[PDB]
Design a protein around this nucleic acid. Structure first.
Ligand SMILES: [Mg+2]
Ligand SMILES: [Mg+2]
Ligand SMILES: [Mg+2]
Ligand SMILES: [Mg+2]
Ligand SMILES: [Mg+2]
Ligand SMILES: [Mg+2]
Ligand SMILES: [Mg+2]
Ligand SMILES: [Mg+2]
Ligand SMILES: [Mg+2]
Ligand SMILES: [Mg+2]
Ligand SMILES: [Mg+2]
Ligand SMILES: [Mg+2]
Ligand SMILES: [Mg+2]
Ligand SMILES: [Mg+2]
Ligand SMILES: [Mg+2]
Ligand SMILES: [Mg+2]
Ligand SMILES: [Mg+2]
Ligand SMILES: [Mg+2]
Ligand SMILES: [Mg+2]
Ligand SMILES: [Mg+2]
Ligand SMILES: [Mg+2]
Lengths: 225, 156, 212
RNA sequence: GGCGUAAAGCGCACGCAGGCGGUUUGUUAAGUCAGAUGUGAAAUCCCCGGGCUCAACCUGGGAACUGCAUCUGAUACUGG
RNA sequence: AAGGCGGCCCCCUGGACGAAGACUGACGCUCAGGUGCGAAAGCGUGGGGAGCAAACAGGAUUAGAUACCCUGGUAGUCCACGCCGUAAACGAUGUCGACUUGGAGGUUGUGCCCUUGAGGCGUGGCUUCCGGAGCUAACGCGUUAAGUCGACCGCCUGGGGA
RNA sequence: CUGCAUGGCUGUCGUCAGCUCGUGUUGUGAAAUGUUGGGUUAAGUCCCGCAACGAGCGCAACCCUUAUCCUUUGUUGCCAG
């Protein structure tokens, strides 16, 4: 689950080369191997356990969490983990102003019911095919990005960033609002705007799946009443 | 509850292909009047919209200041891009000895007696930020004792 | 000239005519002369009353003017005496006997002519044009209109150089021909010239064309 | 207060007088720090009271005159 | 040090850096006056003068063209000793000390590793680009700071008149 | 008489394709993103990428005529038999 041994065989060692490392990452990085910085599990694991404890502490009570992992390979894993844990997520390009511009994104969220009526009802029955094709194309385009947050309604309570350097836009919008973020950073990331730092690999196929499984397990164990 | 107050309104312009289009800017200061203060600089095509635009941002961008019973704790100086502010705690009855865009924000914040002085360029836009940074950077005896590791009476 | 009149561009599609009859131009000129005379007489008489519009039908050897107004009580009078009083003059002006109908208009702040009216009265009584137009557009938006656009031009506020100000809310699709774009004009005779007012009120998209 | 661009780095280098000066001990105590004495006129300002019916004005005491000289000590810093 | 320095060879000489070693023991930094060096242009003497080229001659465009263009052409550019000490003499940033995240290089030493390739791990000197914090009105500077200081010198106080 | 006080109407750029706003963000601030960049087009038409997310006036469609066929009803319009 959170044991140190499983991460070694899953692969957390190689995060990035030694020419891309962020200067304020000295303490988390143990050393350099083959001109590639290697993270240390002896400090990776306890902070991850603390983050899991603090996250299930919120999961037990009320609160919605975000699962921003918008990578080219981790999208399916994020979607599966979110569906398993019964939480919300986004699996496409992070729309700038999704949390700080909720006053306007709520209109977009509320417009995939009256606009999806073309697909679930057809109005009469697929009225005016010439514009009905445009209607269904825009419906598909609209929920392609925000299909995982259509059942939220209110503002989220906690954030989970998989790539805290690629998704600094989400962190910037979370910070000025004031919601906790349990983000996992790489050797080339900044542990400044994130509230909880989880050093280690994030762009590996197996590491992201392991982290998603762990977070899903802890969030479904905290809220199991 | 709040003590919202407009400081000044300025008229800006922007030349375009068809001509010059005007615009208005509003600067406002809000606060509960006890220990909180915030500033808002809004811009809109008209004076009535700009003032509300500034007011909303001032309301939602307030800053809490750990002031004394009626004054500020210790004399402080704030430095901004073009304005320098100096604020000294006065005695009871002196009033808000300030000028420009400082006395209004000081009265909205909650302090009642302070000697304020502006050095450099005395523009409202920069002086408001300078005088709010001066109140943000200052600390209370309890706050300084917390980092010192001793008691207020010990660090008297 | 920039914009064409939005009524006579969709009169044949979604908008109704203000005069419904037939002629073989043996009497067409005198018929419109009579229509113009009765319309101007009604406008001059019912000044205090907020008349919305005047539709005219001309059957054989008879006429029927169906005035639409917001406050019909003033025109009606006690026991319906004022209408009988003002019906004989219309009948004798038009020659053939008349039968005046009066229709109350619901939502008096959502009619183009009504919203274009009384703003001239406010300007005459020296009410600021900006606040007047803002109140008119906000009331029209609140009542249910999907789009309102108000333009006021000429010697605004008694200045030295005339200008043209305008406000707009919602959406006003002037180019489409499948929507209610009810539009009317009015003018104010102030102490320093004349002020022109134009109002466009988009209510909805009338699918199917004429006859609902 | 500033000197890259508004006014402000000598074109550069050497160097006299001058300005400053790494680290430890002992000594001196010149600057510096403490106390005391004389003086720093009266007048004037300020504080507490009084007299002019109030005030202006006058007046008693106190404080102050931020300075100087001498004496008796303190030795951390600067100075020999 | 600045100005500046470009075939090769010889003669004399200044300066900088590094591996390890011992002493001299504050001898250290800056500098008003003062001295010295100081691009090119310029002047005096005695020479040299291929090319280039102020002044000048002719042609050409243009209303005019005492210029840009073309054909020649003197001083000058060259050598030695002399004189002035002027430049956007610019990094528009006066000398030194230590402190304050990184990446990619350039040049030049030095220790050790199987030097199988300009293989790797450290450490110095000079210098280029990007950039974090910080600073600045902004541009931008950013371990060679325009970031926080310390010691010294010079200069600035509205634009013209100057 | 004053279109150098105007209302209304009209010409031009141009039937060019741009012109703006709300929220958010960036810079103290005038302001910028959105509207740029890649394909694409008759086009701010669409897509992708991107501190942008949406909307309005706009580019199109709905409107009028004509290009084929079916049906309803044949005089003053037609002659398969
Ligand atoms: Mg100054
Ligand atoms: Mg200068
Ligand atoms: Mg200049
Ligand atoms: Mg210099
Ligand atoms: Mg000189
Ligand atoms: Mg002494
Ligand atoms: Mg003494
Ligand atoms: Mg008395
Ligand atoms: Mg005295
Ligand atoms: Mg000594
Ligand atoms: Mg040598
Ligand atoms: Mg000198
Ligand atoms: Mg020369
Ligand atoms: Mg020649
Ligand atoms: Mg020549
Ligand atoms: Mg010569
Ligand atoms: Mg000079
Ligand atoms: Mg210079
Ligand atoms: Mg020197
Ligand atoms: Mg060098
Ligand atoms: Mg840089």
């Amino acid at each position: 689950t959170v044991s140190m041994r499983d991460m070694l065989k899953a692969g957390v060692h190689f995060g990035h080369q030694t020419r891309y490392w962020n200067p304020k990452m000295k303490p988390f990085i143990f050393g350099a191997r083959n001109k590639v910085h290697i993270i240390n599990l002896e400090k990776t694991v306890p902070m991850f356990n603390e983050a899991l404890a603090e996250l299930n502490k919120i999961a037990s009570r009320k609160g919605k969490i975000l699962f921003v992992g918008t990578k080219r390979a981790a999208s399916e894993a994020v979607k599966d983990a979110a569906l398993s844990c019964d939480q919300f997520f986004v699996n496409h390009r992070w729309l700038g102003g999704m949390l700080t511009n909720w006053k306007t994104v709520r209109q977009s969220i509320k417009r995939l019911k009256d606009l999806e009526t073309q697909s679930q009802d057809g109005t009469f029955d697929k009225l005016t095919k010439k514009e009905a094709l445009m209607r269904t194309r825009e419906l598909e385009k609209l929920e392609n990005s925000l299909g995982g947050i259509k059942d939220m309604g209110g503002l989220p309570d906690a954030l989970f960033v998989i790539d805290a350097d690629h998704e600094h836009i989400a962190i910037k919008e979370a910070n000025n609002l004031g919601i906790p973020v349990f983000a996992i950073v790489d050797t080339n990331s900044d542990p400044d705007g994130v509230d909880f730092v989880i050093p280690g690999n994030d762009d590996a196929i197996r590491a992201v799946t392991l982290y998603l499984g762990a977070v899903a397990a802890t969030v479904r164990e905290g809220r199991s009443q | 509850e709040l003590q919202e107050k407009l400081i000044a309104v300025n008229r800006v312009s922007k030349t375009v292909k068809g001509g010059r289009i005007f615009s208005f800017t509003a600067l406002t200061v809000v606060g509960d009047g006890n220990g909180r203060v915030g500033f808002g600089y809004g811009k809109a095509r008209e004076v009535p919209a700009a003032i509300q635009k500034a007011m909303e941002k001032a309301r939602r961008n307030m800053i809490n200041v750990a002031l004394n019973n009626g004054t500020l704790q210790h004399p402080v100086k704030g430095v901004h891009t073009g304005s320098r502010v100096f604020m000294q705690p006065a005695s009871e009855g002196t009033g808000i000895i300030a000028g420009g865009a400082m006395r209004a924000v000081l009265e909205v914040a909650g302090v009642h007696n302070v000697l304020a002085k502006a050095y450099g360029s005395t523009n409202p836009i920069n002086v408001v930020r300078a005088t709010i940074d001066g109140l943000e950077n200052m600390n209370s005896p309890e706050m300084v004792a917390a980092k010192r590791g001793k008691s207020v009476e010990e660090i008297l | 000239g920039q914009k064409v009149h939005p009524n006579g561009i969709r009169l044949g599609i979604v908008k109704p005519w203000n005069s419904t009859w037939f002629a073989n131009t043996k009497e067409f000129a005198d018929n419109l002369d009579s229509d113009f005379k009765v319309r101007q007489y009604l406008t001059k008489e019912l000044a205090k009353a907020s008349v919305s519009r005047i539709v005219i039908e001309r059957p054989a050897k008879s006429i029927r003017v169906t005035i639409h107004t917001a406050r019909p009580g003033i025109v009606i009078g006690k026991k319906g005496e004022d209408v009988e009083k003002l019906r004989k003059v219309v009948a004798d002006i038009a020659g053939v006997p008349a039968q005046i109908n009066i229709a109350e208009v619901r939502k008096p702040e959502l009619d183009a002519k009504l919203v274009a009216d009384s703003i001239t009265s406010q300007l005459e009584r020296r009410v600021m044009f900006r606040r007047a137009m803002k109140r008119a557009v906000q009331n029209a938006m609140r009542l249910g209109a999907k789009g309102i656009k108000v333009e006021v031009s000429g010697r605004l506020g008694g200045a030295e150089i005339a200008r043209t100000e305008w406000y707009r809310e919602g959406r006003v699709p002037l180019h489409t021909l499948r929507a209610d774009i009810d539009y009317n004009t009015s003018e104010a005779h102030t102490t320093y010239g004349v002020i022109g007012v134009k109002v466009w009120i988009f209510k909805g998209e009338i699918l199917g064309g004429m006859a609902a």
